[PDB]
């Protein structure tokens, strides 16, 4: 089905009754409220665009405010879009709550991971370090060789070298949802999800079997 947009609150644990600690991530999922519905007859695909949270009145621009004003909804902190599953139906301005996950049993959580900046190939690609002694001259963490010789005389595409690690979309699949709390607007999933605390998540039902 569709998913909901959360916010990574942090991690805790949930002691079970038989004494098994479960590492959970707390995801506050407020009222995701639908701002646009997309049909084949106008867009070629069925999908809903939701917003969540709240934004300052002076910080939302006039394009954006006109969009949310047409939808008849309060401006949120962003717009996201979920593809619909052929028998689902939503209306504009409809609110969607964490209660949707009261049946789902296992979810997939998509966020932007923590940006580690320009990372070298030992951090980035798990290259193995060369000797730390035994003669080695200024080449301890360096990548070694990068290709062959006259044949090809080029470095191939997607050679693993150093550069920006982190700060990109990653999806963690098949996380066990531990609690759905409709009162406090919370979703407790088992495990770590991507992102620092306060980062926006996207929690969908698991597509894997």
């Amino acid at each position: 089905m569709i998913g909901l947009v959360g916010k990574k609150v942090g991690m805790t644990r949930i002691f079970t009754e038989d004494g098994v600690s479960i590492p959970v991530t707390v995801i506050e999922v407020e009222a995701n409220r639908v701002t646009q519905v997309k049909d084949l007859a106008n867009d070629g695909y069925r999908a809903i665009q939701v917003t969540t949270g709240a934004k300052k009145a002076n910080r939302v621009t006039k394009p954006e405010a006109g969009h949310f004003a047409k939808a008849g909804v309060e401006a949120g902190r962003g717009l996201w879009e979920f593809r619909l599953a052929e028998g689902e139906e939503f209306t504009v301005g409809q609110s969607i709550s964490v209660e949707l996950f009261a049946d789902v049993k296992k979810v997939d959580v998509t966020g932007t991971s923590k940006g580690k900046g320009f990372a070298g190939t030992v951090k980035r690609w798990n290259f193995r370090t060369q000797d730390a002694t035994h003669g080695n001259s200024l080449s301890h963490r360096v990548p070694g060789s990068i290709g062959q010789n006259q044949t090809p005389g080029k470095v191939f595409k997607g050679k693993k070298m150093a550069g920006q690690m982190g700060n990109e979309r990653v999806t963690v699949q098949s996380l066990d949802v531990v609690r759905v709390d409709a009162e406090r607007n919370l979703l407790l999933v088992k495990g770590a999800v991507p992102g620092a605390t306060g980062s926006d998540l996207i929690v969908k039902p698991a597509v894997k079997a």
Partner: protein, 114 residues
């Protein structure tokens, strides 16, 4: 983190006794052996306490019929059934890891009595 602070304190057990490192402590622990749920006892000197609310641990060191054992316990686990303080102990540090190097008469902790 009022969400997490509110959510953890719903799980914290209330009757955890006040102990500090240096104390001899009996900890009764639920041990499950197939169908029977036994409760066994682990008595030793507290050598370390981490206080973090729900994530509070404490390390207890025993010299069990041979060599020495350190159990770290999660204080607010339902496994950890009872904590009782046998002998109150007088030390000066907060983490007593030097006792890992001492046996017998050298690993001997004075009593606190106040």
């Amino acid at each position: 983190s009022n969400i997490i602070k509110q959510l953890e304190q719903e799980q914290m057990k209330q009757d955890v006794p006040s102990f500090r490192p240096g104390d001899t402590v009996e900890v009764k622990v639920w041990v499950v052996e197939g169908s029977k749920k036994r409760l066994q006892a682990f008595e030793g000197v507290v050598i370390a306490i981490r206080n973090r609310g729900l994530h509070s641990a404490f390390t207890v060191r025993k010299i069990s019929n041979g060599e020495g054992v350190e159990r770290v316990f999660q204080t607010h686990s339902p496994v950890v059934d009872s904590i009782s303080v046998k002998r109150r102990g007088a030390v000066r540090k907060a983490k007593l890891y030097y006792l890992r190097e001492r046996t017998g008469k050298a690993a001997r902790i004075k009593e606190r009595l106040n």
